[PDB]
Design a protein around this ligand. Structure first.
Ligand code: SF4
Ligand code: SF4
Ligand code: FES
Ligand code: FES
Lengths: 633, 633
């Protein structure tokens, strides 16, 4: 089973699924082979009813689409649609939170409130919203209106782009016409320009894609900002991960999806319902996380993470998962069918994300506590039905230190230099103790043995003294393999990095180092890494494309990951992707995305499926940046 | 060549292309055969990097997508994306016109102005915008702001839906949650919900698709409204169509695309440049139309239509097309390559729609006259280079009477009943002289011999006394085969329909009938048919799903046509489509779209590729509606 997942708990559940005849994501992948090479290379178009059009990568006809669309146009249009779809997800998440904040401060949703008043005021100041003499509720109402205004054209550009990057970077992007005019405006313009008989120049198409990726960035940053106002900015926390966090004698409730607007409430209400669970014969309610909603409550409340991404079905296979509470994004719809075999109650909560055969509970912010209790009572009912039945929870878990928001990272650094907190980090970049920074982001993908690229690359970078930060299911992969346990610093980290992690941790009263990898949160919280990198650029007086900072979507799957990778390139980072995106059918598109975009934004994609080779390429990118700053490497 | 096109001028140019070795859309189609059956049936998904996933329609594995997405989810997600892409095009067109009107009334674009002040005031009244005591420029500024506001969420729903359909229809749609909250909001929500791991219930997905189709309707209606304010509401006009409208001794300039914001200016400026053209050895500038921008200037100014849709390359093959001036949508990008052989200067004008190898002229409303003169001077240069060369313009054209805006139709009817203009039409529906109404809409499609479905269906309906109206390239197909020439009324029309067309025409001072088919304009001007049908419903006191009105996208191609067909169903019409949409791989989706949606909106799709059978099915739908109103049939 090691060829499917490198996670030993997942392997154990794959054996259980096999002997019980439960079909998994890996079985469905095997049944798909061999996959279509036209789609894999990007040489397929279905944008009108004259299609499908395909193009043979080499040889004889077909060589061009029916309407005349070339291989490079077809490849660029498909890629742009993926970017727009990703932007639509991250910004739909952000839009929902903006409406939640507006309802809260207008007295329409008493379960929600301004929890981080400091963050509220800093965001207002960053946006140019006056705070002196204003009530918090009025400032927040203005912030929520500004968030909603960024979805459409107005007299200013998207402020969740222009106010979050340094003026020099905004100037570069503006010169190329890349600043978004409105988030949903850009998504719609992509769908228009890529429709039949519209944009048919690969460079023009890809420039539109870069601009739409910045609309995705704006949605990510807005989502983090609003979630922090509503639910609190993360600070360091200690918890656990992997399937062993499930407890046979408790009501096990997974929160799964991305938007934690209800799942933050689930966490608090579940505490109130201890006694009701105890009356049912359970020790209590054990809330666990899956995917990014799990990251959100891990970051803010220390909720343990049960599993992530490709292996999500395995939590159900234990037999102990009483409920899976779903919002949207990255939920395999197979869960609704597997639930018939495993007994789990799968519950959807968002109007636009339902799954046939799953129970739906309308969630409304105005009734959030009431909805939570109804949902948790279904979970309690499910626990009762399995009283007495054996379960198979693998006794496998790791320790996870997390909660490294950018505010938390700055505060940790400020223990070494109170009035200039970024300086200790820059000092160690300059002296070589920190070679550079790598952000791991994105998903697992069934084509890659689960976690193998994240861990193989992370190990090589850590040995070379790279400061590694992680979000999303990249953070999930690293946490499940021990990369967030400070006890593994000695094994994993080069001497210089160990010295820095130890110096920071000792100054924070820990008696021990920071963990080998800093967990910066969910997928939208890739925006936190942007905030840190922008602050470093501002402090050094250089643009982001001069910093020794790279990104790696080492096992990417979702359209959201394509959008993130593209905005990482657009803000100026060398950006690795470890699965093939559908671009290899066009050499001109590949050349733009891996080479000539350097001349536009300073960033570029590094496509590399072999993880040892990818780590070498990422280190070369970091070291090239070091050389450009005159640093040793 | 008759198997490729039923248009004799197109056949002549296909022979010329063949002997000159110029590859056409039909050659590129032949080179694509056999096409992929997974894509044709809808059983392919590329929404994440685990794909492509396909599903065998019958037999053995694969049976389900890798993530667990069923055939019905995959089919519904793909369809929803097509609807959103169509909505993005029609509403991008409308958004551009809203910005043009705003610039005009703020003194920023002197080439544009309020030409239809009556239409402006009626729209303002329909929207609830006060007009008493207000300057026209202020009313128009308010209308343009309202148009822009409908793209995003606000305290009202999309007013270009709720103010254009009768309250009873709005109530039905509201009860099912189908009223759009904002145009670009719905497009983004579709892209979100159809991304991996999000909506996975076919009924829920398709209801979202119906709502997004109404965002498309709003964009169509807004585009017609704003184009009428800026450029004038159409009134009846007489002109010609087909390749014989090109003139060997003139500078022939085609306007091609959809948004006539510059091409209306091209028409006026070309008149000013007669003498400059005459100095070059030409008789003048002969502006001709292709596709919907051609329809726009045909409707408003009588500009002759040269060709449409699938046969657009053939205008270039004549050797006489000096320039092709492009905005966006439905332009085969092959034109940029064919131009090397034919000498035509292909010019793009919109930032988001460029074609490699075509000259780009930045158009800006603020410089519209200056841009037009630069473009027309390139055309004049091109004419000079072909002085002396023979050309092959087929001597084939038809007479076209057009300009039937809904205002024009009401005014024509008012000559029979001044104070109750709809009553003469209803009278003849009730007595059987008019059996019903059919709207022909949409594109040609290379899979169908060009125009064969439109003409075969139209002939059968006209013989059965159906009032036939047409837009877009459906109007193009019918005009090129004589269906807009009143001289063909005797041959084509049943006795009852002939009596009505004759009575209306005689009362309008014509001495002869209205044409066999009423040309209601461009693709966005499908909204004019909605306005007429809604007015009829309001006058009869019934909802639209009780009227004997149907639609036929008989040769559909573009994502825009999928969106139009879907909103035709959503507002309550039986809606034929004559090419296979990618739904046959899912019986449950097909059943929803062809059967159970009747219980939701009262409309339904009729999928039928054989045109004689399609006409029988459309007549059965009309006659079922007649029976429900207690009428003979
Ligand atoms: S848009 Fe062009 S390439 Fe795509 S399916 Fe239609 S004809 Fe084929
Ligand atoms: S979304 Fe599901 S069905 Fe579509 S490509 Fe990804 S795994 Fe396959
Ligand atoms: S031919 Fe397989 S993805 Fe289209
Ligand atoms: S397998 Fe051919 S369209 Fe995807």
């Amino acid at each position: 089973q090691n060829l499917k997942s490198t996670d030993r708990a997942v392997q154990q559940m794959l054996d259980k699924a096999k002997r019980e005849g439960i079909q998994t994501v890996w079985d469905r992948y095997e049944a798909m082979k061999p996959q279509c090479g036209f789609g894999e290379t990007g040489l397929c178009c279905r944008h009108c009813l004259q299609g499908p059009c395909r193009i043979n990568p080499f040889g004889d006809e077909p060589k061009v689409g029916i309407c005349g669309a070339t291989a490079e146009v077809i490849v660029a249009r498909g890629l742009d649609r993926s970017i727009a779809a990703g932007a639509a997800g991250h910004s739909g998440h952000a839009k929902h939170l903006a409406h939640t904040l507006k309802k809260a401060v207008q007295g329409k949703a008493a379960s929600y409130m301004i929890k981080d008043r400091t963050k509220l005021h800093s965001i207002a100041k960053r946006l140019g919203i006056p705070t002196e003499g204003q009530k918090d509720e009025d400032i927040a109402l203005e912030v929520a209106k500004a968030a909603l205004a960024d979805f459409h054209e107005k007299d200013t550009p998207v402020l969740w782009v222009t106010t979050v990057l340094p003026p020099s970077r905004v100037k570069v992007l503006s010169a190329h016409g890349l600043i978004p005019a409105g988030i949903d405006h850009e998504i719609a313009e992509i769908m228009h320009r890529t429709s039949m008989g519209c944009d048919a120049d690969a460079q023009n198409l890809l420039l539109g894609g870069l601009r739409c990726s910045l609309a995705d960035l704006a949605g990510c940053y807005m989502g983090t900002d609003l979630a922090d106002i509503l639910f609190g900015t993360p600070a360091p926390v200690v918890t656990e991960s992997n399937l062993g966090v499930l407890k046979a004698d408790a009501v096990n409730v997974a929160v799964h999806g991305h938007n934690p607007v209800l799942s933050d409430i689930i966490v608090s209400v579940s505490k109130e319902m201890e006694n009701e669970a105890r009356a049912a014969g359970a020790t209590g309610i054990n809330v666990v996380g899956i995917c990014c909603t799990g990251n959100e409550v891990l970051m803010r409340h220390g909720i343990p993470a049960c599993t992530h991404s490709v292996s999500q079905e395995m939590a159900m296979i234990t037999g102990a998962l009483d409920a899976m509470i779903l919002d949207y994004q990255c939920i395999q719809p197979s869960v609704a069918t597997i639930a018939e075999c495993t007994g789990t109650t799968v519950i959807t909560t968002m109007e636009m994300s339902k799954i046939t055969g799953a129970t739906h509970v309308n969630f409304a912010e105005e009734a959030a506590v009431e909805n939570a209790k109804q949902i948790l009572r279904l979970a309690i009912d499910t626990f009762k039905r399995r009283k007495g039945k054996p379960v198979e929870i693998p006794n496998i878990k790791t320790k996870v230190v997390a909660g490294f928001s950018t505010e938390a990272i700055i505060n940790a650094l400020s223990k070494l230099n109170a009035n200039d907190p970024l300086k200790p980090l820059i000092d160690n970049v300059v002296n070589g103790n920190i070679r550079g920074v790598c952000l791991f982001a994105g998903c697992n993908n069934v084509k890659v043995p689960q976690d193998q690229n994240f861990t193989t690359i992370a190990r090589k970078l850590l040995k070379q003294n790279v400061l590694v930060v992680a979000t999303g299911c990249g953070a999930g992969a690293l946490m499940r393999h021990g990369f967030m346990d400070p006890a593994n610093v000695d094994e994993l980290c080069g001497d210089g990095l160990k010295a820095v992690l130890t110096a920071i941790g000792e100054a924070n009263g820990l008696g021990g180092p920071l963990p080998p990898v800093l967990h910066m949160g969910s997928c939208v919280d890739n925006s936190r890494a942007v905030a840190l990198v922008a602050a470093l650029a501002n402090r050094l007086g250089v643009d982001l494309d001069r910093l020794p900072v790279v990104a790696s979507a080492a096992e990417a799957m979702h359209e959201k990951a394509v959008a993130i990778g593209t905005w990482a390139v657009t803000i100026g980072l060398p950006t690795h992707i470890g699965v093939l995106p559908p671009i290899t059918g066009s050499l001109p598109v590949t050349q733009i995305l891996t080479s000539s975009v350097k001349d536009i934004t300073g960033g570029y994609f590094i496509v590399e499926l072999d993880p040892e080779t990818a780590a070498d390429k990422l280190l070369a990118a970091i070291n090239e940046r070091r050389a450009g700053l005159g640093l040793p490497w």
